[PDB]
Design an enzyme around this catalytic site. Structure first.
Site, PDB file in Angstrom:
ATOM      1  N   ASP A 155       3.915  -3.996  -8.160  1.00 27.26           N
ATOM      2  CA  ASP A 155       2.527  -4.017  -8.609  1.00 27.26           C
ATOM      3  C   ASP A 155       1.612  -3.261  -7.654  1.00 27.26           C
ATOM      4  OD1 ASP A 155       2.951  -5.411 -10.981  1.00 27.26           O
ATOM      5  OD2 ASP A 155       2.745  -7.369 -10.004  1.00 27.26           O
ATOM      6  N   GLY A 156       1.978  -3.179  -6.372  1.00 25.58           N
ATOM      7  CA  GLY A 156       1.213  -2.357  -5.450  1.00 25.58           C
ATOM      8  C   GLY A 156       1.256  -0.887  -5.818  1.00 25.58           C
ATOM      9  N   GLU A 197      -8.790  -7.931  -8.449  1.00 25.24           N
ATOM     10  CA  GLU A 197      -9.914  -8.733  -7.978  1.00 25.24           C
ATOM     11  C   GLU A 197     -10.696  -7.977  -6.911  1.00 25.24           C
ATOM     12  OE1 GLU A 197      -6.559 -10.049  -6.698  1.00 25.24           O
ATOM     13  OE2 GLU A 197      -7.174  -8.397  -5.393  1.00 25.24           O
ATOM     14  N   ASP A 221     -15.238 -19.227   3.964  1.00 20.95           N
ATOM     15  CA  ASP A 221     -14.534 -18.014   4.372  1.00 20.95           C
ATOM     16  C   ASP A 221     -14.912 -16.817   3.510  1.00 20.95           C
ATOM     17  OD1 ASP A 221     -13.317 -19.348   6.378  1.00 20.95           O
ATOM     18  OD2 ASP A 221     -11.273 -19.211   5.584  1.00 20.95           O
ATOM     19  N   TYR A 254      -4.340 -13.117  -6.156  1.00 16.23           N
ATOM     20  CA  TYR A 254      -5.053 -13.891  -5.142  1.00 16.23           C
ATOM     21  C   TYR A 254      -5.767 -15.088  -5.755  1.00 16.23           C
ATOM     22  CZ  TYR A 254      -7.664 -14.428  -0.715  1.00 16.23           C
ATOM     23  OH  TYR A 254      -8.184 -14.884   0.475  1.00 16.23           O
ATOM     24  N   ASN A 255      -6.386 -14.892  -6.926  1.00 20.26           N
ATOM     25  CA  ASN A 255      -7.057 -15.971  -7.645  1.00 20.26           C
ATOM     26  C   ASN A 255      -6.188 -17.218  -7.748  1.00 20.26           C
ATOM     27  OD1 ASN A 255      -9.037 -16.995 -10.004  1.00 20.26           O
ATOM     28  ND2 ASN A 255      -6.910 -17.185 -10.706  1.00 20.26           N
ATOM     29  N   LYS A 256      -4.904 -17.037  -8.071  1.00 20.31           N
ATOM     30  CA  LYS A 256      -4.016 -18.182  -8.241  1.00 20.31           C
ATOM     31  C   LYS A 256      -3.822 -18.924  -6.927  1.00 20.31           C
ATOM     32  CE  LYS A 256       0.397 -19.565 -10.222  1.00 20.31           C
ATOM     33  NZ  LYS A 256       0.951 -20.288  -9.042  1.00 20.31           N
ATOM     34  N   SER A 257      -3.718 -18.178  -5.823  1.00 18.89           N
ATOM     35  CA  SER A 257      -3.534 -18.786  -4.510  1.00 18.89           C
ATOM     36  C   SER A 257      -4.748 -19.590  -4.076  1.00 18.89           C
ATOM     37  CB  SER A 257      -3.235 -17.703  -3.474  1.00 18.89           C
ATOM     38  OG  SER A 257      -2.011 -17.044  -3.762  1.00 18.89           O
ATOM     39  N   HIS A 305      -6.212  -3.507  -3.410  1.00 25.90           N
ATOM     40  CA  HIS A 305      -5.608  -3.350  -2.090  1.00 25.90           C
ATOM     41  C   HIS A 305      -6.559  -2.746  -1.060  1.00 25.90           C
ATOM     42  CE1 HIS A 305      -3.063  -1.516   1.062  1.00 25.90           C
ATOM     43  NE2 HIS A 305      -2.266  -2.545   0.837  1.00 25.90           N
TER      44      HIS A 305
END
Ligand SMILES: C#CCCCCn1cnc2c(N)ncnc21
Ligand SMILES: C#CCCCCn1cnc2c(N)ncnc21
Ligand SMILES: C#CCCCCn1cnc2c(N)ncnc21
Ligand SMILES: C#CCCCCn1cnc2c(N)ncnc21
Lengths: 261, 261, 261, 261
Positions: free
Chosen positions: C45-46, C120, C147, C160-163, C220
């Site tokens: 995905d990167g 995101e 943060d 990231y949203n899920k984390s 990224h």
């Protein structure tokens, strides 16, 4: 005995400091900021944290006291209006002392640096992805992928630890608590998720997988460390001592700070 | 010494039980399920919990051992293939014992009932809304509105406690941990949110606000209590004892159960 | 039509790229990495995210396709073994296209910069404390202390949203989702806590309180911005287009990535 | 047109209801609680929910209005002091209407029952363990083990959904949101964890694994269902209509309820 006072530096705290010095001048007390036996902090918990770290080499010989000029702090638990009563009771002495546990952080390179924390120590990467292997008493526990990790003292559990979902621990428990910052969990990457509470003499080791540069914080201080081989956490043998003059239970302090006051 | 074996009751566990009894018949061991000194549980953690509660009045005189015939359990930490080695080492004896803390629950009415938990004790309402005042060492801490509350032992922290967001605590820490079930938080109703970890001798009291009927669970047992005036939690003075024959650290047990095995 | 292929750059992905180019050479296809109509991404995905941002100015004229050479990605959802079948079906064409929503970020100073995100956009401070006022459609909603904050697209909700505890949203929903990073909540500082899901045409504005320097990430890419007056989030009018050749439902993709595959 | 008023039943709400009826008596309005075109709810959100379910068969022909006599509600968003102004503006009419989405629940047996929810529908077991297979558009997504599941409307996201960690969704988004209650996650049992947001026309099906008895709630109503073969969730085709007389944005309503007012 000997004493010193640190101030937040705004007008309110400096004037309060001068008035307490003047009041102390009426007793058998000497102002000494080199080898004090009592350290008074006037400000907030940040001011108190700087006082702690200013004297973290004479922790066995100092009882700390905090006065909060702004909001109530967990360490600064005296109101400014009680300063005169505080001077009087301190001058006589015969108070009793309360001790909270502390966290020891060891950072090894390819020398070695140790730090003491009153609230917590956190580890993040220096820009790129944060991946470390988490080793508990020499047993490989997990490979952590995420933003970072936070190891908290009991009294620190109400600080950053709380914001990360950690439990609040009564400070009579000699322990440290490890919490995750935004961990990645899918079918190939797995962390425990839950906060982990470790007793005295357990050693938690962070070991790099790829990058060896980390941003390590200890309370308010944050330093970029390079060529790190290991980060080591354990409950310190040293403890911070508080002069206590009345009953202000930890759980009441938690109530006053988060529920209502 | 004297011993007994409890089985999950499926074919695998009963046959394993009969084979261990036959193997025990070659040693100075007597089968006695009234006053045993060793209690072997063959099944899962549910089977082990029933064994614990079967003998919770002779906890000082019993060392427990669990064999897992299905998945690995936190209490049943022997594989069935090692049963023969387990019989042999148990028969000689001279093993060493490990103790975990337990939770005491007191339910008062307008008599009084006490219960011992190995995992946790939970409180929910009997249908309507659950509202209780949470009192910590006689200090009113919060008014909790939500689905319910869970108080966990250290070894229970890997069970329901973990599903509610609680921390995992090493069982050498004599403590209990209180977690919330779906608390309501708005600008008029306020709970602490975070799990709370209490040391030995702290008393957490739940006191009704309107309804006085509650569904109280203790490990697997769940009873509807009526006309409740108070629910009282504290670390028990009693402890469960495990016969240990090799090294299987708690944190390794956590790794094997939640990360990989 | 015209096409180009981007590679992760390891041996596996480059060789796969050369083989697809050779296979494409047997059809009415032209390699053009300036004005392609099909962009194939070989890697993870990167790699796909870099392909998206390489051509984010011709989004209306491009259909993207991802091949995953490592683990399954949410954007790279073709296996390398199907590359030959992919060349064949792509060459004929007559595939159908699927569109996902995108997030627009506007950063204003004292000029103005706009960015497009597929996953995101996050905001953190440049070292010191992060405090911003959160303004929703010109209505002051909260003062956030913590943060940082994360605004996610629907397809970004699995990243990231899920984390951060955010919900997973099906990408047919034209929305963006704002999640908190370690917010401070006590009786004086109050955030909503919960993730917030905003529809199309709602504008979320971040406005500085003290410091005006922020570290802003877009997928990224992470840049330190100075003298910021406002950060503006809204669902973009532009959309990313995928060439689809078979059924691979989003919820099946979520299952394969987080439950089992 | 025709109208009716429901009251919470305490003295304040009944008297307010009689005064509005008297004020309405000065206009071309008829009190009719069989086929009203306007339904006024005086009380809290519970009173409003009962009004909604009282007339859930004439939803296309009714505009709802809520007056809050206690705390501010998300549906009862008029103060009692504005009742006279509300009577006046309602009597003229020419207000504009706002529609929120609703959730359809279908329960099938071995007949079939359908329910409409304004806030949410939850499923729990009838005592024993709750295990269901979660099927999304006929695709088997997960096996859920835990306390239960909650499916929320957008306007319901501020209710039970919020307490379970769900996102808050603006009610202009036609969606439903599924949240977990205390899910069990270890190396053998795996749930997604995150809330899931589903668009219109997606069908989420719960299918029993062992037990077929479930306690199903729909808003305030909770019924024990026996011999269940499937529970089916989807965004309803029907919508609730609100008479609106001024600007009270959803996000402002969220601010007033959870941040400060
Ligand atoms: C902003 C910011 C950082 C936190 C400031 C307040 N603070 C400092 N230390 C503590 C603590 N131990 N418990 C609770 N609150 C604390
Ligand atoms: C289903 C279900 C209920 C839990 C079954 C497994 N289980 C029982 N006790 C424990 C425990 N102490 N730690 C971890 N897992 C445990
Ligand atoms: C490590 C790291 C960062 C994430 C890498 C994997 N990744 C990238 N994008 C996504 C996405 N949209 N959904 C799920 N996973 C994704
Ligand atoms: C206690 C209790 C149950 C909740 C009472 C308040 N309440 C009812 N409905 C809602 C809603 N939709 N959003 C926010 N709050 C709501």
């Amino acid at each position: 005995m000997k004493y010193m006072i640190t101030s937040k530096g705004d007008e309110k705290s400096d004037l309060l400091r001068l008035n307490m010095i003047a009041g102390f001048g009426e007793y058998d007390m000497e102002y000494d900021d080199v080898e004090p036996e009592i350290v008074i902090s006037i400000g907030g918990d940040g001011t108190f944290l700087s006082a702690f770290h200013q004297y973290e080499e004479r922790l066995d010989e100092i009882a700390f006291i905090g006065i909060h000029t702004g909001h109530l702090g967990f360490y600064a638990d005296w109101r400014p209006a009680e300063a005169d009563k505080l001077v009087k009771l301190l001058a006589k002495g015969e108070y009793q002392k309360v001790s909270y546990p502390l966290l020891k952080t060891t950072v090894k390179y390819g020398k070695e640096a140790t730090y003491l924390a009153l609230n917590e120590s956190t580890v993040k990467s220096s820009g790129g992805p944060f991946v470390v292997d988490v080793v508990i008493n020499d047993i490989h526990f997990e490979r952590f992928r995420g933003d970072g990790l936070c190891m908290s003292t009991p009294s620190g559990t109400t600080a950053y630890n709380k914001s990360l979902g950690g439990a609040l621990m009564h400070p009579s428990i000699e322990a440290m608590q490890l919490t995750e910052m935004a961990s990645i969990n899918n079918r190939v990457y797995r962390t425990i998720g839950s906060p982990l509470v470790f007793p005295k003499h357990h050693v938690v080791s962070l070991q790099p997988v790829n990058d060896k540069d980390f941003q390590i914080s200890v309370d308010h201080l944050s330093i970029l460390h390079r060529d790190v081989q290991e980060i080591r956490y354990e409950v310190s043998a040293k403890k911070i001592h508080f002069a206590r003059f009345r009953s202000f239970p930890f759980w009441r302090r938690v109530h006053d700070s988060f529920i209502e006051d």
